[PDB]
Write an enzyme that holds these catalytic residues in place. Structure first.
Site, mmCIF file in Angstrom:
data_model
loop_
_atom_site.group_PDB
_atom_site.id
_atom_site.type_symbol
_atom_site.label_atom_id
_atom_site.label_comp_id
_atom_site.label_asym_id
_atom_site.label_seq_id
_atom_site.Cartn_x
_atom_site.Cartn_y
_atom_site.Cartn_z
ATOM 1 N N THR A 93 0.803 -1.215 0.000
ATOM 2 C CA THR A 93 0.000 0.000 0.000
ATOM 3 C C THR A 93 0.840 1.270 0.000
ATOM 4 O O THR A 93 0.279 2.365 0.116
ATOM 5 C CB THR A 93 -0.945 0.014 1.209
ATOM 6 O OG1 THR A 93 -0.237 0.476 2.366
ATOM 7 C CG2 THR A 93 -1.488 -1.381 1.478
ATOM 8 N N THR A 94 2.158 1.158 -0.125
ATOM 9 C CA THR A 94 3.053 2.309 -0.116
ATOM 10 C C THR A 94 3.678 2.600 -1.471
ATOM 11 O O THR A 94 3.783 3.765 -1.858
ATOM 12 C CB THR A 94 4.169 2.104 0.916
ATOM 13 O OG1 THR A 94 3.604 1.646 2.149
ATOM 14 C CG2 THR A 94 4.917 3.407 1.161
HETATM 15 N N1 LIG Z 1 15.691 -9.405 2.492
HETATM 16 C C1 LIG Z 1 15.265 -8.499 1.579
HETATM 17 N N2 LIG Z 1 15.941 -8.297 0.427
HETATM 18 C C2 LIG Z 1 15.527 -7.400 -0.488
HETATM 19 N N3 LIG Z 1 14.428 -6.639 -0.344
HETATM 20 C C3 LIG Z 1 13.655 -6.737 0.764
HETATM 21 C C4 LIG Z 1 14.041 -7.695 1.811
HETATM 22 N N4 LIG Z 1 13.117 -7.593 2.785
HETATM 23 C C5 LIG Z 1 12.219 -6.651 2.397
HETATM 24 N N5 LIG Z 1 12.539 -6.141 1.193
HETATM 25 C C6 LIG Z 1 11.780 -5.093 0.465
HETATM 26 O O1 LIG Z 1 11.172 -4.189 1.388
HETATM 27 C C7 LIG Z 1 9.863 -3.830 0.936
HETATM 28 C C8 LIG Z 1 8.907 -3.706 2.115
HETATM 29 O O2 LIG Z 1 7.681 -3.125 1.674
HETATM 30 P P1 LIG Z 1 6.487 -2.846 2.718
HETATM 31 O O3 LIG Z 1 6.959 -1.799 3.699
HETATM 32 O O4 LIG Z 1 5.982 -4.176 3.223
HETATM 33 O O5 LIG Z 1 5.351 -2.188 1.785
HETATM 34 P P2 LIG Z 1 3.912 -1.792 2.391
HETATM 35 O O6 LIG Z 1 4.237 -0.829 3.508
HETATM 36 O O7 LIG Z 1 3.186 -1.167 1.225
HETATM 37 O O8 LIG Z 1 3.332 -3.108 2.851
HETATM 38 C C9 LIG Z 1 9.420 -4.904 -0.045
HETATM 39 O O9 LIG Z 1 8.928 -4.301 -1.246
HETATM 40 C C10 LIG Z 1 10.658 -5.727 -0.343
HETATM 41 O O10 LIG Z 1 10.963 -5.668 -1.739
#
Ligand SMILES: Nc1ncnc2c1ncn2[C@@H]1O[C@H](COP(=O)(O)OP(=O)(O)O)[C@@H](O)[C@H]1O
Lengths: 77, 512, 521
Positions: free
Chosen positions: C78-79
């Site tokens: 959602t971001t």
């Molecule tokens: N171990 C990792 N390696 C690479 N990218 C990561 C890892 N852990 C998380 N991410 C990235 O961090 C992002 C977290 O997004 P998130 O804050 O969950 O979005 P929202 O707030 O919309 O739910 C993800 O899009 C993911 O691609």
């Protein structure tokens, strides 16, 4: 011209082409929206009654005559 | 009272260069707009060439001064490619402007630009195809195709094209340079029966006639032009000076004392062999009679260009003395004819020992046809000279920049560094020629650039742009080409100018 | 008018999107919010910021409404949609200013989204388990934050994978359901951290103050009771209208004589130990200890709910009040197999062997910090979420930011091969896709210009030379700025979530671009 401008093409060129086609082969085609070109209307299932144009033109002419015949000064209370 | 160093200085330099870039832009194609320039005197002039506009304009900016100096040097060393280099430099600056304020050191883009320029030069060298006496059997078909290509640039008559081909082929003898600034051309005025005529020799303009001008012979067996700066006019000589006025015998005495020296001088200057006097000042009334009584020739009112052409063709020498002359600094002709056509008297000096200049008389009997239709023949003879002298050639138009841009874009996808975006911007900035060519003709470049990119995505031919039919056709079949040596020099000059502009970081001023 | 209010809306959208930009991923700073009163709230969650924020612009209002509608049905994602919409708007602004009809760029964006969806739907993974859930050595270390212990993480990963694969569940009769999630925990202090055991059957609460049961023989089944008998009033069920000052001393004996037949009927077949909560007297236990029927004290509501939801033996079907003279059925009888109180961790807890329906494992912690309850719990939650999301739907993609480069390259190739009026729109849509890896590299205090370039150079080789589709899909890393293969140890993400997010972003962009003027007409 408004339809050609809203469709996304040259309005002057389309109007000139339509005028040339009407002067050459009388009833040719018009302006398409779905395909985005100049195609014949006989294939597309779309028609309209003649009253929606005759009544509209008569009402427009009457309104124009009424707004043109009214002049002089506009006195108030 | 404010000044900086680095990013603001580069921004100010780019903004100053954009002014001189937008000042000259519409004058690029063959049918560019005209510009009227006037100074503080009160005389205005209409011109459309970029070099003439850049020469009659001064900028108080260092970057603009360096740019116009580089442009003038390129125009003087080559002769083609003045506005294109400026437009390319402006596009490069506009593309590099957003990649500066983001905290990027400009010392890493110079190497990328140099590598891109080297790759483009190598691609142009490996893609250029030259042809010079290797096919088309005898040279008759070669010259026929050359004349056809010369007449294919402008839709004119067949006789005019044939006369232009004759006048461009009958002057290739001792000329070994790469420009037509040696022999030159001269447009005459008036009318005749035919449309155009050719002759070998020096021409002349209208000459004033007097009473008894037919006493001189019309044809000469061995004429010798008298190269004397002095003239024989009523203002030069004199019949009465400072003398005591008493009777009429003193007048005759002084006129005889003057006529003795006059006759001595004329016989001394005529004994050397010169008999065709070409006086700069117009002749009088008694001078013509005195010249006809001695069975000699007289003239008057002649420009300096005609005298220079006569000295260059007949081989005359510069004489800085009136009397005490010899018989070695004089000119020698062969056939001197005087033929009147319409309402003017034309002269023909045929038989010069040094075949240098030739007269191409173009008179149709009008007042506007002489000034107009004068750039087409110049462009035709320039194309003929470029095709005859230069060996390497390539398809002209907007068919060589799109291929280079596509090649650079395809090559930029195989480098894992910061130069990827630099090469991408360099390839994107190369598209400024066909867009401007389409905008100058009053067309829609958005409907043509997409078709060009679609055709060059997998074809890779010589499909350029059109003007008359307004479509996309092959430039290799339209009989339009360009030398493969001017584009390389123009690109090198543009790259050097861009590097010199991006190398300047700040300035230093000194009051006293 | 016309081109001014659109630029104003674009600027407002960019300003409202440049707020949650520095909070994407697990590595991010905190944000403070004030309610214009005096209290401050510190949070670093994008959803909490987007939910607790004032708005006054119609475009921003409809964007927040669309984001809330997307979050109401989709868990995460959602971001990035707001950033994608802002980038699409800032890229289409130049196209509109370059004298281009918005319908053309809208159709181009639609075609690009359709092509991207079609290319994504042809790149999935059919297998769901690879050598035991990614070799059971890589799918647990990345989902567990190791800051104090990491030398013996292999044993913890093996325990986790065993607990998540040895026990399953099925109830919808169509797809395997997720296993147990609310497993029992036991926080210990001063134990050997280099040794751990795994036993079957979860235990209840520790009986303290009433351990006078000589457990020597092995029983069979047990029972359960929600209420508790008492002489005077204490809980619910005692009548308040009956006034008897002399019957209160003999109500316990009467209740015992009444429940004697129930206890005798329970002792038949195979049922001895009953489950009674607090409030019972010791005289009943002392009188029933001569027959073989006892009662385990220390029973809470959580244990009763767990027993009712595990084995399924409910009590509300028959018993509801204090009237114990109901019918005798098998619904209120705990049909087990073996209930023994072994000697574990120097304690005597209820050990139920061979439990029907579900079979949970007792996870006992070791002597360390109290934060250990939050170290393996998040890993187990992530594991169960993964095995419950990728089971019924085999549409998963590897990596996190290694798929945008290939999509952009494919969109650029399609735009170059098309050559129509909707050519620049696909190119702009492809260029507006490298905003997630750049943000991830910026938030990680690394150089994004080199990282994105290396990622694109590595992804172009997989498309120029068609060699394989499963390998050569390296991406970014969080530990350092080095490309790592997100296949042997990466974390997969659901593709349906990304597809829905992209569709919602495209719909929002189209809706914003379709808005002309905002003047009161
Ligand atoms: N171990 C990792 N390696 C690479 N990218 C990561 C890892 N852990 C998380 N991410 C990235 O961090 C992002 C977290 O997004 P998130 O804050 O969950 O979005 P929202 O707030 O919309 O739910 C993800 O899009 C993911 O691609």
């Amino acid at each position: 011209s408004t339809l050609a401008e809203n469709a996304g093409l040259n309005p002057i060129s389309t109007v000139t082409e339509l005028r040339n086609r009407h002067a050459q082969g009388e009833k040719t085609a018009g302006i398409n929206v779905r395909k985005g070109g100049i195609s014949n209307i006989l294939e597309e299932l779309v028609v309209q009654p003649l009253l929606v144009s005759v009544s509209a033109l008569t009402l427009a002419t009457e309104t124009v005559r009424s707004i043109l015949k009214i002049d002089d000064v506009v006195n108030t209370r | 009272t404010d000044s900086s160093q680095g990013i603001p200085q580069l921004v100010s330099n780019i903004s100053a260069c954009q002014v001189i870039a937008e000042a000259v832009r519409t004058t690029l194609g063959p049918r560019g707009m005209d510009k009227l320039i006037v100074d503080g005197r009160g005389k205005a002039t209409i011109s459309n060439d970029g070099a003439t506009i850049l020469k009659l304009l001064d900028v108080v900016h260092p970057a603009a001064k360096t740019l116009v100096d580089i442009a003038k040097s390129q125009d003087a060393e080559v002769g083609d490619g003045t506005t294109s280099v400026t437009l390319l430099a402006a596009e490069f600056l506009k593309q590099v402007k957003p990649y500066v304020e983001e905290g990027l050191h400009p010392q890493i883009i110079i190497r990328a630009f140099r590598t891109a320029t080297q790759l483009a030069v190598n691609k142009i060298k490996e893609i250029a195809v030259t042809v010079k006496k290797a096919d088309k059997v005898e040279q008759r078909k070669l010259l026929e195709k050359c004349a056809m290509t010369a007449l294919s640039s402008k839709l004119i008559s067949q006789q005019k094209a044939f006369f232009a081909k004759m006048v461009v082929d009958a002057v290739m003898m001792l000329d070994d340079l790469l420009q037509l600034k040696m022999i030159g051309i001269k447009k005459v005025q008036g009318g005749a029966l035919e449309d155009s005529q050719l002759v070998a020799g020096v021409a002349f303009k209208k000459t004033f006639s007097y009473a008894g001008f037919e006493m001189q012979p019309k044809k000469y067996h061995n004429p010798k032009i008298a190269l004397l700066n002095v003239e024989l006019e009523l203002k030069a000589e004199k019949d009465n000076a400072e003398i005591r006025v008493h009777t009429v015998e003193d007048y005759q005495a002084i006129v005889d004392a003057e006529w003795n020296i006059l006759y001595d001088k004329l016989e001394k200057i005529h004994h050397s062999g010169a008999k065709v006097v070409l006086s700069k000042l117009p002749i009088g009334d008694v001078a013509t009679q005195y010249f006809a009584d001695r069975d000699m020739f007289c003239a008057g009112r002649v420009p300096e260009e005609d005298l220079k052409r006569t000295m260059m063709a007949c081989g005359g020498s510069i004489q800085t003395s009136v009397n005490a002359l010899s018989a070695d600094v004089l000119g020698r002709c062969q056939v001197f004819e005087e033929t009147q056509i319409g309402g003017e008297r034309y002269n023909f000096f045929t038989g010069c020992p040094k075949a240098k200049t030739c007269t191409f008389i173009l008179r149709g009997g009008a007042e506007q046809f002489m000034e107009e239709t004068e750039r087409s023949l110049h462009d035709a003879i320039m194309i003929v000279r470029r095709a005859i002298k230069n060996d390497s050639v390539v398809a002209g138009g907007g068919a060589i920049e799109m291929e280079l841009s596509k090649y650079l874009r395809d090559y930029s996808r195989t480098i894992p560094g910061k130069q990827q975006l630099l090469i991408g911007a360099y390839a994107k900035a190369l598209e400024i020629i066909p867009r401007q060519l389409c905008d100058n003709a009053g067309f829609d470049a958005t409907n043509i650039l997409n078709k060009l990119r679609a055709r060059h995505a997998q074809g890779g031919t010589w499909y350029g742009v059109d003007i008359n039919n307004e479509d996309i056709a092959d430039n290799f079949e339209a009989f339009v080409w360009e030398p493969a040596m001017v584009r390389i020099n123009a690109l090198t000059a543009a790259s050097e100018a861009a590097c010199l502009i991006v190398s300047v970081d700040e300035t230093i001023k000194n009051p006293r | 008018t016309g081109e001014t209010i659109r630029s104003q809306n674009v600027m407002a959208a960019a300003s409202i999107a440049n707020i949650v930009k520095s909070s994407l991923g697990p590595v991010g700073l905190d944000k403070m919010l004030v309610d214009d009163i005096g209290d401050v709230t510190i949070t670093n969650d994008g959803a909490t910021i987007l939910k607790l924020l004032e708005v006054e612009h119609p475009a921003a209002k409809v964007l927040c409404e669309l984001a809330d509608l997307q979050d109401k049905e989709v868990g995460d994602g959602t971001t990035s949609v707001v950033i994608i919409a802002a980038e699409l708007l800032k890229n289409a602004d130049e196209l509109v200013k370059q004298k281009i009809h918005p319908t053309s760029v809208i159709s181009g964006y639609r075609l690009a989204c359709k092509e991207a969806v079609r290319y994504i739907n042809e790149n999935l993974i059919v297998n769901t388990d690879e050598l035991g859930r990614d070799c059971l050595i890589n799918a647990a270390k990345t989902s567990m934050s190791s800051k104090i212990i990491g030398i013996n993480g292999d044993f913890f990963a093996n325990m986790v994978v065993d607990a998540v694969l040895a026990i399953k569940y099925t109830d919808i009769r169509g797809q395997p359901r997720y296993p147990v999630n609310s497993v029992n925990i036991l926080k210990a202090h001063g134990r050997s951290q280099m040794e751990s055991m795994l036993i079957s059957g979860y235990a209840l609460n520790c009986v303290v103050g009433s351990q006078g049961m000589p457990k020597r023989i092995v029983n069979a089944k047990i029972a359960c009771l929600d209420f508790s008998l008492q002489k005077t009033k204490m809980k619910l069920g005692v009548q308040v209208v009956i006034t008897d000052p002399e019957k209160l001393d003999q109500i316990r004996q009467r209740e015992s004589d009444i429940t004697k037949e129930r206890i005798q009927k329970i002792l038949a077949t195979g049922a001895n130990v009953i489950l009674t909560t607090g409030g019972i007297d010791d005289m009943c236990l002392k009188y029933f200890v001569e027959a073989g029927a006892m009662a385990v004290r220390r029973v809470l509501k959580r244990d009763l709910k767990r027993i009712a939801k595990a084995s399924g033996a409910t009590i509300l079907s028959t018993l509801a009040n204090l009237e114990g003279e109901e019918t005798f059925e098998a619904a209120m009888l705990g049909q087990a197999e073996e209930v023994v109180q072994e000697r574990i961790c120097d304690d005597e807890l209820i050990l139920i062997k061979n439990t029907k329906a579900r079979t949970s494992a007792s996870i006992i912690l070791r002597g360390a910090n109290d934060f250990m309850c939050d170290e393996m719990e998040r890993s187990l939650h992530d594991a169960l979420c993964v095995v419950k999301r990728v089971l019924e739907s085999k549409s998963v993609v590897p990596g996190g930011g290694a798929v945008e480069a290939a999509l952009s390259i494919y969109l650029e190739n399609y735009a170059t091969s098309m050559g129509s009026r909707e050519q620049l729109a696909i190119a702009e849509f492809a260029r507006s896709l490298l905003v997630i890896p750049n943000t991830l590299a910026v938030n990680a205090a690394q150089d994004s210009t080199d990282l994105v370039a290396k990622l694109r150079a590595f992804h172009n080789e997989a498309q120029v030379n068609p060699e394989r589709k499963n390998l050569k899909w390296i991406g970014l890393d969080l530990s350092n700025g080095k490309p790592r293969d997100n296949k042997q140890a990466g974390v997969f993400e659901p593709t349906i979530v990304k597809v829905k997010s992209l569709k919602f972003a495209t719909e929002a962009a189209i809706t914003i671009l379709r808005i002309d003027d905002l003047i009161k007409l």
